[PDB]
Symmetry: C3
Subunit: 438 residues, 3 copies
Amino acid sequence: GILHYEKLSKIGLVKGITRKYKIKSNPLTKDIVIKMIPNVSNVSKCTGTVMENYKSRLTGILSPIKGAIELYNNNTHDCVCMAGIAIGIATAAQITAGVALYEAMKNADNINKLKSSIESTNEAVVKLQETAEKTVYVFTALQDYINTNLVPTIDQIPCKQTELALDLALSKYLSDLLFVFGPNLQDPVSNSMTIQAISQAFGGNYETLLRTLGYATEDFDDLLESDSIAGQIVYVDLSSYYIIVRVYFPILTEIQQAYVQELLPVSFNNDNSEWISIVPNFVLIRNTLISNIEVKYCLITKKSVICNQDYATPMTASVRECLTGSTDKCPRELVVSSHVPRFALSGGVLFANCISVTCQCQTTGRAISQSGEQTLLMIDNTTCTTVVLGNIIISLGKYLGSINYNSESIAVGPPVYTDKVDISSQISSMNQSLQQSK
Amino acid sequence: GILHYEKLSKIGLVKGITRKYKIKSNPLTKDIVIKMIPNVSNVSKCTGTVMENYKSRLTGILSPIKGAIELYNNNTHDCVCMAGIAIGIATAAQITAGVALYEAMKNADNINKLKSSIESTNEAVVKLQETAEKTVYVFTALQDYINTNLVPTIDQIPCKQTELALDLALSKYLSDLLFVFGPNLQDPVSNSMTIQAISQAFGGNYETLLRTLGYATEDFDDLLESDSIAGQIVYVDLSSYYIIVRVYFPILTEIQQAYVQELLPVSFNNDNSEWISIVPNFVLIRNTLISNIEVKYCLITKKSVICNQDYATPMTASVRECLTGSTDKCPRELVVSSHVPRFALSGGVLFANCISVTCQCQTTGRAISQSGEQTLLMIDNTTCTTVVLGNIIISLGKYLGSINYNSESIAVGPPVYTDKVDISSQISSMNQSLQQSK
Amino acid sequence: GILHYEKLSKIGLVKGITRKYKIKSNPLTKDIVIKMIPNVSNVSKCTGTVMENYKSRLTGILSPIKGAIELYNNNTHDCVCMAGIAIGIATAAQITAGVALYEAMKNADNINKLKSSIESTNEAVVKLQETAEKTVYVFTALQDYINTNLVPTIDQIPCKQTELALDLALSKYLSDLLFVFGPNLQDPVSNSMTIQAISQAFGGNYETLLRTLGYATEDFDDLLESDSIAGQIVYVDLSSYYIIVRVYFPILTEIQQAYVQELLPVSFNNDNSEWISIVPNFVLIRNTLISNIEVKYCLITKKSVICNQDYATPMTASVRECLTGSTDKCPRELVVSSHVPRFALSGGVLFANCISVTCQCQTTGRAISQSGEQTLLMIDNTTCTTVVLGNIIISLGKYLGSINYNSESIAVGPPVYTDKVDISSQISSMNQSLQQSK
Ligand SMILES: *[C@@H]1O[C@H](CO)[C@@H](O)[C@H](O)[C@H]1NC(C)=O
Ligand SMILES: *[C@@H]1O[C@H](CO)[C@@H](O)[C@H](O)[C@H]1NC(C)=O
Ligand SMILES: *[C@@H]1O[C@H](CO)[C@@H](O)[C@H](O)[C@H]1NC(C)=O
Ligand SMILES: *[C@@H]1O[C@H](CO)[C@@H](O)[C@H](O)[C@H]1NC(C)=O
Ligand SMILES: *[C@@H]1O[C@H](CO)[C@@H](O)[C@H](O)[C@H]1NC(C)=O
Ligand SMILES: *[C@@H]1O[C@H](CO)[C@@H](O)[C@H](O)[C@H]1NC(C)=O
Ligand SMILES: *[C@@H]1O[C@H](CO)[C@@H](O)[C@H](O)[C@H]1NC(C)=O
Ligand SMILES: *[C@@H]1O[C@H](CO)[C@@H](O)[C@H](O)[C@H]1NC(C)=O
Ligand SMILES: *[C@@H]1O[C@H](CO)[C@@H](O)[C@H](O)[C@H]1NC(C)=O
Ligand SMILES: *[C@@H]1O[C@H](CO)[C@@H](O)[C@H](O)[C@H]1NC(C)=O
Ligand SMILES: *[C@@H]1O[C@H](CO)[C@@H](O)[C@H](O)[C@H]1NC(C)=O
Ligand SMILES: *[C@@H]1O[C@H](CO)[C@@H](O)[C@H](O)[C@H]1NC(C)=O
């Protein structure tokens, strides 16, 4: 690759798995209905004031979301035609989500004609014919719990306990719902809300939601774990207590001439001390351009790095030069923890710090020795066919690089400290020196 | 406001929603009892050794908490009168919590006179008359589960399976409880423990707790999501296995002459490349003082920023000058990701980077062009009444700033890189240069 | 200790609790079987296609894990001998985990001889005789739910609702399972994944797992909360849908001549302003060596700091000199928030910023005054026996340090700003100054 792997390997940074870059795109939209209140028609004998109190509590949660949705519904018309003077302040994502909301209102209007049928649902999952060809699924929360726990036990227990059990179930449902659908949800007009978060209105059963929707594909689990499947609330009903959610199932596009290269950090010896290299562990290479990538927001598999959006971030010229060969530009940090890697395997070849760990060859019985002028030792089956590292015995391959690897040395970079307080102290010391300098 | 909004918008910092500052204060205290063990009197036929093992396991969890509480209970008198010699080491928060614990012990002593009544509770929520006027609520864990699942199925299933079901429910209850009430809780003498965390002793039903306690308030959900409602364990019983928790319910005070200003980041063009501005997105302004605010610990709504404590943090003079007009002091960062904003709306006026995106006007049909010397374009209805951005059509309004906005240019700040490894490399390179100079 | 506690306290770093350092070591291994599919033989009348669909969905989840495990199984032989040529790329942790997997395969082969007995399990927890002396426990998911909820209600409700209830339970089980056992688990050959994460295959009942395994020890909860108890998947069956997990039980080893010292930050007055000190709050001292420690990954109790591995990190020379007495090297930060501590107690002695908070003595009735040249006031019973801080009254001990503490002053360190944008701006400004100089 573009990176100088041979020079990188001598300061740790052993070449790891090469993964292709995938980003979701081209979503397909399906509409579902989540009914936030169960049907207690069959336990209504002693529901008491529990349902009235629950409806009063749920109206206060659903009302701000509805108001924020009609804020964009009222100011979007047909020339998608948005009035910026009434909207006032919005971001590009908010305006795009408003456009998507306007597009979804066409189907929401057809769905809303089945309000009585939605009210009459008495099962957790039901199918309704929105049109002659389109079917809408209604997902009722706690309906399964009521049907399988409260209906069979109405006449067995004093149903004053059924009222308390129903009250506790509704409040526990609200307890899990409040983190996602509460005041934290200040921007319901957005398509970045994952289906897992939306499923909290259905008890967290996004598996049931997606399986019922019939979304079958090879990349289903990858899309789920990359947070690429998203839902958007397009309508809120305060009389029947249900929401219409549009689920956007996209497909993964492999970015052409793009891959993510992983570097395995290995401690190396320098100046009679143990060091580690402070460089990005994951490097994104698009065409011939080298840049950082925030892989913590992505899904990392053994074959590809999967993200819901482009997470590329800039890279300094010094770090780019370090990755392209200038090993003197690579920052390094002292090693004081005993639990730090000291060897790694790449292409059947072992890169080990044989000063911190004991390297012994099984073929000859003689220990492999590392001098004080060598940072790492490259052990292939030319040096000797089988090396022993304590309880580990490994058969080695042949190195595809230079034959004088262990004879040719390099230069090491400047030591650094990556702790927050240490960074602040370094900045202070450098400023107290720079004031004298200038 | 005090900020220079025009110059900030010229570098892509578009003015956002202005929110007032709210901090909780003046809490009212209520005492509740949480019984960590259910009443199995009606399933006692084949509970077996399960209850003995559960009590043995729960004693080891509750003993350190009781010891830590008695550490402060034993060293507080009337001469709130605290003996610092015996306490030894404590913080201001710990001492204030000890004072609150001493205040709560007066009511805890009255509550403890109903120990037999607490032991005899056989419902999830019961009401006990602590005095002639005060009422205390007892919340029993898994009591509803036992009453609605195990009691009705005593004679139907082989009750050796009931013993296994009871054992699994208790162990699952301990599994969720251990993260909050385990060795992590090293400081039970503190009033910073949220009611949501305390509710883990009741299966996570803080909604049930707060609804039973009453607590009718408009700011109820805001207080819940700002982590302002807190509870404190004031007494632990190792014989009846219950705890007394004092719930603190504060009110939200709007800080006078204080508001939080949000800045919407928009990419801008400079030197034939795309850049973003590295400035705080949320700026707290109290009176005429500008400072940072850690909004990640607060609750953000469309109307206010709500925090459980003051989260103001200092700001550098350079950043303050950047926010007050000195745009040459504003750090900027290169843009390499495709998924960063290019336009935003503020006051009916669109600030767009018409080089990265296509700006076309519907009224005239001609594309809106941005020269290479302009960072951003301000598009108001004085220019043209309706702009088109791909699939988005927006009606704009008059701008309230300078009429020569698109003719007047500004200066741009120094480029920076905000990655961790990039920061370390920059610090090392700058130290190398400084050492070479001196 | 090695730290200069007096000078540290004079800049608001009051000595806290001294905790010893503990790291897990010498694990003992026990093998368990988790059956990912329940036995629905007693509700098979109307399970329908639900079980077939669930098996199809679960095969896709479990197949990559089995493939990754067989990747190491196929390339490990008795000759522990590993073929590095076929492995290609691996880290030291991966190779050690492969060695552990090879060691566990010997017992996995004996366990797999009871495949029919594992298939026939119809209880949540059962005991099987793997050999004449060894015992293996099988944990079946949702088996208790089926036995106690679906079997008793087979003929009471329309069993078409039983099929929907079974479908929802299986899908909810998969929803919780997907985060741990989904595409995120790209490296099943590793012994660093905790038993709590493993328990997600059993509904999160790690308490049941460990109690059934019979692991009884004093440090049980400490090992649990330090993330020291870990499990490794050693075998995956795609025909019976179960996994074999080897649980590692380490012991907590107290590091000799090592302890973690905590410093309590207290605001202090300087130049008519309030400041805080930016130094590490937790300092790890091993022998005579001072270094940082990442205590966020560890478990902190009142007696010791417990970690699953060594988390020591380097410390700069400037920060070390600050901790050892050079108070002019200690970075300090301005105080703008009202909710920052102003006093603390250590050894019965109060260190308070009496400029910011009102200090009054009860014994004499006269207020304690702090001059503008003093950062903090040390108040012991030599000064006066009982101090009052608002609603707090504390009896004080005697200071064991210098008697001229409040008369001797020190020098203060350079001011710093710890915000991210502030750090970037400071770096840019210092680079601009350095470039102007050179
Ligand atoms: C939107 O318009 C409806 C009437 O169509 C009105 O009831 C509602 O209050 C409006 N909401 C907003 C936010 O303007
Ligand atoms: C409610 O009860 C009636 C009569 O007992 C029954 O026909 C109906 O199916 C029940 N509803 C549900 C959802 O089971
Ligand atoms: C050494 O490893 C290489 C792998 O590159 C392999 O082809 C070769 O057979 C091995 N043995 C020898 C003696 O080269
Ligand atoms: C700067 O470098 C010198 C020598 O290279 C070193 O002694 C000093 O500690 C370094 N300081 C910082 C803040 O990096
Ligand atoms: C507190 O005092 C009680 C007796 O009133 C005693 O049993 C207990 O052990 C003491 N605890 C501590 C921490 O001193
Ligand atoms: C326990 O059983 C008795 C007799 O069947 C009954 O009177 C009592 O109400 C039951 N307890 C509860 C809490 O239901
Ligand atoms: C531009 O919008 C303002 C309101 O913001 C309006 O008063 C003015 O007449 C508009 N000019 C047009 C439509 O040309
Ligand atoms: C400092 O600024 C110069 C020019 O402004 C630039 O070339 C260099 O990369 C910068 N270095 C750092 C560490 O900011
Ligand atoms: C399944 O049903 C049979 C016949 O009713 C019964 O003997 C057996 O115990 C049941 N299985 C379980 C696990 O209860
Ligand atoms: C491992 O070997 C088995 C046969 O023993 C084979 O079925 C399987 O595909 C192999 N897996 C890998 C990753 O080589
Ligand atoms: C002051 O505190 C010390 C420390 O415990 C104590 O020994 C002494 O009795 C106290 N009183 C006096 C008058 O020294
Ligand atoms: C450097 O120090 C000077 C005076 O000591 C100060 O004015 C300036 O703000 C500091 N710059 C930093 C900390 O970036």
